[PDB]
């Protein structure tokens, strides 16, 4: 068997080693063709038809580019072909755990369907990878190409999910620490997975990408930091690193958190929840699983993709009527109505436990306005979005090591003040979107009054259209004007 | 209510009139989200994840651009807002009739499943459009925005499929004949549908597009030709028009007729044929249809998309085992093996009626090579591809009218010699690909010997790799040496 | 005479009205072919070969696009063909006043050569425009196409330079106030000139542009604000508007203020100053002008372009030896050495009057570190860069009017807190770059010690490489540690 | 000294070895910043501001990419770092010999100014390279980095100009023959110089490029052919190779041979010829040269760039009045008028020696039409363009070697019949453009009559607009009708 070339619109011609091809040509990997990268986003950006499969190829490619570049510049690192292949495989396989409509599944559906369980796509990816290896006789192929399965499978999993539990890794030692910063960077989030989705999502969304990953690679080096060998960026690239996270935030703002994309994701999730008792997925030993329990059996999970949306949509069973009707309303674009957006002021943050109390709060507000209709808690959806630089409150650039041209082997730190006073002073905030399930004109008018009143009662920010949608309410709050 | 803006990666911001939005937001139109533009091509070019839905939006957009531009430059044409809307609707809806995996359905599956019927995507599009209008109460909406449904629905259908049967059209008169040249140009094939797929397919495939549709629009005018008002191009654009068809041929050669893309399409078609007795699709009156008969009932056809592939793949029914196994082999990349390509020589053309006799012919050849295995007719697939400039033998540029700068209202003709001696001497040819269903090394070696011998016996062209794959056969033919 | 089409890499096919063509085809306009958009930037980014001429065409094009879009959406504005042409002409002609190497001339050379005079490219553009009109018999042509020269020439000049001096404009009245916001927006800096250079500079520099001007145009409307009709943006676009200025800042940071591009601009300016007594430029009446005095006579200024660089470089006159030698050193890449960058802290701001005193201060600093060589004020260059959002300390978005979907004719305001807490807290800062004219290793080491000591003495920010370049000095300043 | 990174819009980040930087940072190399790649093309395509300098960097980059890829795939070739550097230097330096406005200088000016001499840019590049090496002490630097100047300078020159005059090369032996196929491919024209200008010219012109050089590199291998090791392409790439030449032809047709770009080049050449007696360029020993004789002294030639255009344009010397006036007319767009285009038929070919007789022939034609004015030989310009695939009549693909997947070390040939029947049947043709120096309406009408009559008299092809421009002449020729 020989290497294969794949033409990708983002990366051009990607060379795949025979071992990589063997891993790719399995039901577990090919499954990713049937899961949309941006889920409900496709229903707002028609270009975003792209799936997790092509993203995965790109991540594997870029992982190879970075590890190869480091090895070529610094032979002293002793990076090996075996190392390169393991990094590529991890890059290739770190999206294996995604479910129907990607983030919607891990972000919205599973938390509601199975609150007791803890689930992440990372854990899913490790489980799927194991299933892929075992179901397709990959281990023999790995030794054929010089890999040592026991150590290297461990190494690959560790790159995906982190320590499987002083040096916490078993797949490689401290001297090769930098290898763990390529595919999924737990230290500061600067990894090749972001680089591919920036470029790929932008290509499909029809929005341009400002981050130059090729430049980053060119300026990347490995230096000793606290007795570890780690990837360091050239000092002058610090502005570009801040911009990388800015680009991520802008993609979330324009696309991933689009108000309508989110509501479509919300509606699809509700449809899945209502279908969950009735859809069956056959797993290992012929046993039957549900959408919510397929995560327990990888054989079942292998067959859990975006297709479930169509299975529900095309169903005739009366048990599926409620779920089916929701999806049909999406098709007719009878969506829940966006009422508005606000943000908390000052120190105050909204806790995850409190999310459920929020619709009730909106319904409880007493706008001093005559209303034809009275709305109830159940008529409102409140979606809270945490926007940050990937490390909650923290500045990820405080967790980057740099080097300077006069001493390329000496790692240094750079503070925010040393860079620009125009940069963010905070690295996390919350957006609160409110929608109404009643779509009639009178209901929407009422919803706007409750919403703006709630904002005022809580001293949230004035909605941008507040003076238009609620001219009677906005005047009462002095701070607003 | 109001117009909507959609951001498209190819065209940027597309404005959709409220009437267009009403048509788009229906089950019949949204269905196109679930049908891949390039079908099996996605399995060779990972970027080609795009669906018929986004292509349809682009076609409607470009149809609007062209009709609008003509009206702005030539007020004397009396192009009306009603005309603009009807052209946009036709552009939007001319892909409604496509089936699962696009060309595979009309090009491969239906011809085999229903040889008696004559089916085209164009006919399908008209039927689906009628179903869309009737199922969603569109006619009242058309009247609201100034359309006259009887005349305008006729006009829209005519743009899609041609005369529904001296001026043959009923939707518009001879003085608006040019309007019929925008969405689906039956005169010479220069239409906005091609312009969108050139740009869109290129963007997703990762191959660059050489044709400038915007330039064409800028140089397009309407002139009187044989007592009809028709779209004419500036004389000087003739080279670019030849190049448009060159671009189309290159896209077919690189992508649409990719040997492996074609074989995947072939395998999927075989799977569908084997599943056809067992898959049920519920149509009007709760009644049940097959993949092959859903075309008879639009309610059933509405639910016939690429999902069928996954329904088969994920099935457990023993009756579907053979169909399911084919799709599973696609996943493992255990595909039928490409043996080679050849072409007829001289005046020889291969008739459609003779396609079935070809595998037998290959199996009947007697290569003077020792073979451990003997292959049979059923082990071979022979795929004949007709590559042309869209009008069989004819030069489409002979069916274009031009105008010159010194007399912009005077239509002229331009012959091929008046342009370049480097242009094609012929405008149609045939490519013949041979594959083998037995994938083992010995079988593939044998298949190569039969194939090259068959080529020699028929006086077809020497396969490009003939001296390598069949060194003992190739020497025999004098014409090849 | 008829309209002309120009193919532009940024905008595609641009249509130019015959009047515009007459203006373009003059020595005064064609001159812009010989002035680089980014001056010394070309010597760092080899792609940035582009000239002011093609930028000007793009600005004229976009000015037309915006005025046309507003008129089509809001017929009630009574925008006239005469208005459209005047806006296009202003867009076309607002770069006429640029001198050799663009910003370098107005930003560096003229302030040093002619400190008494107040010169701006805007003033230059008005003067050149007048010279263009008068020298080429344009006024008759304007009348031919329906313009009224007295009012319209005034209007065009006002768009370029602002009031020529309660409504301050004479070219158009308050009802057409929005027209003044297109070409050069004095209210908030959101104009089509920025939009072209973002796209064009990015195209040539090899840096991606993330601002979508076409989207902005689509969402732009005219609303009444304080008894003026002004351009308003859709409320939703506010994030994108903040990002427009972010993009501008990033282009300055990456490209326009590149440390080496700036030093090359500095060296070229020094060469021009040394050549100024000896280069002659023949103006009106055969009178001779200097590089520094050509601005006084437009006939002379017409012949003052980047050519002057080559005239000096290729000269043999002994008087030009010093100037010529500087340019020759640029060619050998024997440039002054970059020592580092710092910023003021707290309330501290560096005044224009204090710039020379800066080199002396650096030279005056006493490191406490032994040095082989002693450096003098004259050996240092200190370049102070004011980075802001175009309105000094002010937030330009506070000077934008918005509209909301529920009331598109009602102008509103949006504050920064209503948007994101991750946005800049400040909108202006200063960067201080230090270079050394002595390029030897010992001199450079000494320069680094003086520089970091100076930073510490002034309480400026710690240079990013401070611990590497000046390990002895960095510890002393507690604030840094 | 260390490697430098340059950001290029076409290639992104290009790494330059220190030796390459030393060569680049010389007056001889930096000169290329002041010569436009497409000469007069800039005056038709405003995007084409790019210069020979940035093209040269790209060619050096791609030369490195190809040689490095071959070495990585085939260690047995024994490609050395020394080899890589020499190939890069040749790629970098193969444009050193270009003169003002590029092709205009070698293609139009020198043939007229110095008919006795045989001059090519290739010869110029070798001379300039020698001058560069000797003037800047490069040989010691070459030795420092492991080059052997005697052998390697010879090798570099040979790559640029071919054998310096059975293996004809002295710089490398037959086992490294493939190295000579990278920078300037004398065998078939497939070289990295074309690849850069395709991409770069397209980027700037605003026309898309459809040739994928990266793909070509990926599929390139070295195989033994007639006792030489030569670069071979994968068999299936043959279509793409035909398309490479098609792309070249299309760029010539759309851009490089644009009728107006050519006439501007013609006018500039005439201006240079009229200025030649009076412009002085100071060369070695202070001696003076003319535009036409600067090619004799490299020190003078170093200072011969596009600036000559501006020196003439800005001159006041009465002796330069005639030359200056031509350039001023270009600025006013008072260009000679395009009359039309035709081609020879049958076997007819127009020799270089006969070009002079053509204007007289046109003037001699007797159209049987009444004319107000009589035109003379001197009023006509006849421009003959040879359009081919780079090898005159020959098919360059007949001079390409291929390999097949089954036997990657075995070189094969592929004939045109083996490929596509839609490909060109001829590989060379001539275009004849006629212009008139008299631009008045009566003169232009007369010119059209003479032109079409001449075409008929000679049995050339019917001009595309012939029936409009000469309705009384075209009916006469039966072949046309
Ligand atoms: N850019 C470009 N990409 C192509 C072209 N033809 C195919 N591709 C894409 C499709 C695949 O993603 C990738 C590899 O396709 P190939 O046809 O070279 O591989 P295939 O396995 O069919 O051929 P082989 O097994 O090597 O004979 O390149 C082309 O002409 N241009
Ligand atoms: N280029 C670009 N496209 C965007 C941005 N935000 C949204 N889009 C895309 C998504 C859709 O295809 C299209 C329209 O999205 P909008 O958010 O403007 O429409 P939506 O109906 O959500 O808002 P509206 O109903 O007007 O309040 O533009 C953006 O910031 N930049
Ligand atoms: N994209 C593209 N641009 C072209 C092509 N040919 C010329 N251009 C560019 C060059 C100019 O910037 C612009 C107009 O060129 P044209 O050749 O159409 O105008 P020209 O005045 O030479 O012809 P005309 O006076 O109309 O007979 O378009 C082409 O084939 N494709
Ligand atoms: N894409 C991109 N290119 C940049 C950026 N900054 C500079 N460049 C370009 C300009 C040059 O062509 C090339 C190298 O610029 P650098 O600033 O990295 O090199 P420089 O020699 O100025 O710094 P050094 O000597 O390494 O301290 O990259 C950036 O932020 N993004």
Name the features.
homotetramer; 481 residues; four-stranded mixed β-sheet; globular; binds 2'-deoxyguanosine-5'-triphosphate; DNA repair (chains A, B, C, D); isopeptide bond (chains A, B, C, D)
What does this structure look like?
4 copies of one chain form a homotetramer. The first copy, chain A, is an alpha+beta fold. Chain A folds into 2 domains: 1-334, Hypothetical protein af1432 (Orthogonal Bundle), CATH 1.10.3210; 335-481, no CATH class. Helix content of chain A is 42%, strand content 12%. The first copy, chain A, contains 18 helices and 11 strands. Chain A has helices at residues 18-24, 27-30, 52-73, 81-93, 103-113, 121-135, 138-144, 149-161, 192-205, 213-219, 238-256, 259-275, 298-302, 307-314, 321-332, 357-364, 441-457, 466-469, and strands at residues 4-8, 12-16, 220-225, 228-234, 281-282, 288-289, 337-342, 380-388, 402-404, 407-412, 428-436. In chain A, the strands form 4 sheets. In chain A, strands 3-4-9-10 form a 4-stranded mixed beta sheet. In chain A, a hairpin with a 3-residue loop joins strand 1 and strand 2. In chain A, helix 9 (192-205) packs across helix 11 (238-256) and helix 12 packs antiparallel against helix 15. The longest helix of chain A has 22 residues, at 52-73. The first copy, chain A, is globular. Chains B and D meet through helix 11, strand 10 and helix 18 of B and helix 11, strand 10 and helix 18 of D. The complex binds 2'-deoxyguanosine-5'-triphosphate (4 copies). One 2'-deoxyguanosine-5'-triphosphate (DGT) sits between chains D (44-45, 206-207, 254, 258, 260) and B (212, 215, 240, 405). One 2'-deoxyguanosine-5'-triphosphate sits between chains B (44-45, 206-207, 254, 258, 260) and D (212, 215, 240, 405). It is classed as hydrolase. Keywords: hydrolase, HIV restriction factor, dntpase.
């Amino acid at each position: 068997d020989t290497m294969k070339v794949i033409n990708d619109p983002i990366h051009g011609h990607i060379e795949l080693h025979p071992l990589l091809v063997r891993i790719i040509d399995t039901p577990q990997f090919q499954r990713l063709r049937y899961i949309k990268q941006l889920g409900g986003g496709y229903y707002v950006f028609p270009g975003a038809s792209h799936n997790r499969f092509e993203h995965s190829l790109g991540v594997g490619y870029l992982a190879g580019c970075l590890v190869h570049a480091l090895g070529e510049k610094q032979p002293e690192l002793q990076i090996s072909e075996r190392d390169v292949l393991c990094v590529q495989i991890a890059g290739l396989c770190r999206n294996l755990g995604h479910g129907p409509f990607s983030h919607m599944f891990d972000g919205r559906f599973i938390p509601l369907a199975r609150p007791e369980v803890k689930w992440t796509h990372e854990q899913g990816s490790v489980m799927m990878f194991e299933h892929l290896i075992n179901s397709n006789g990959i281990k023999p192929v790995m030794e054929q190409y010089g890999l040592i399965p026991e150590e290297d499978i461990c190494f690959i999993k560790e790159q995906i999910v982190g320590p499987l539990e002083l040096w916490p890794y078993k797949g490689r030692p401290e001297n090769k620490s930098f290898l763990y910063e390529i595919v999924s960077n737990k230290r500061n989030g600067i990894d090749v997975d972001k680089w591919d989705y920036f470029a790929r999502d932008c290509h499909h969304l029809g929005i341009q990408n400002n981050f130059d990953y090729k430049r980053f690679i060119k300026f990347a080096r490995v230096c000793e930091v606290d007795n570890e060998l780690r990837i360091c960026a050239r000092d002058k690239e610090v502005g570009n690193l801040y911009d990388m996270f800015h680009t991520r935030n802008s993609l979330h703002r324009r696309a991933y958190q689009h108000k309508v994309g989110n509501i479509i994701d919300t509606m699809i999730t509700d449809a899945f929840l209502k279908a969950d008792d009735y859809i069956e997925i056959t797993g290992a030993g012929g046993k039957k699983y549900r959408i919510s329990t397929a995560i327990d059996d990888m054989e079942a999970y292998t067959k859990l993709t975006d297709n479930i949306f169509l299975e529900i949509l095309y169903s005739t069973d009366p048990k599926l009527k409620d779920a089916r009707e929701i999806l049909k309303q999406i098709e007719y674009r009878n969506l829940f109505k966006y009422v508005g957006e606000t943000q908390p002021t000052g120190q105050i943050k909204i806790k995850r436990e409190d999310y459920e109390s929020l619709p009730k709060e909106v319904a409880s507000a007493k706008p001093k306005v005559l209303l034809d209709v009275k709305l109830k808690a159940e008529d409102f959806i409140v979606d809270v979005i945490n926007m940050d630089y990937g490390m909650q409150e923290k500045n990820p650039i405080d967790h980057v090591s740099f080097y300077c041209k006069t001493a390329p082997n000496r790692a240094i730190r750079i503070t925010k003040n040393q860079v620009s006073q125009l940069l963010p002073e905070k690295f996390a905030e919350q957006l609160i979107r409110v929608y109404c399930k009643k779509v009639d004109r009178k209901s929407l008018y009422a919803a706007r009054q409750y919403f703006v009143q709630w904002c005022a009662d809580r001293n949230f920010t004035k909605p941008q259209d507040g003076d238009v949608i609620a001219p009677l309410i906005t005047p009462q709050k002095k701070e607003w004007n």
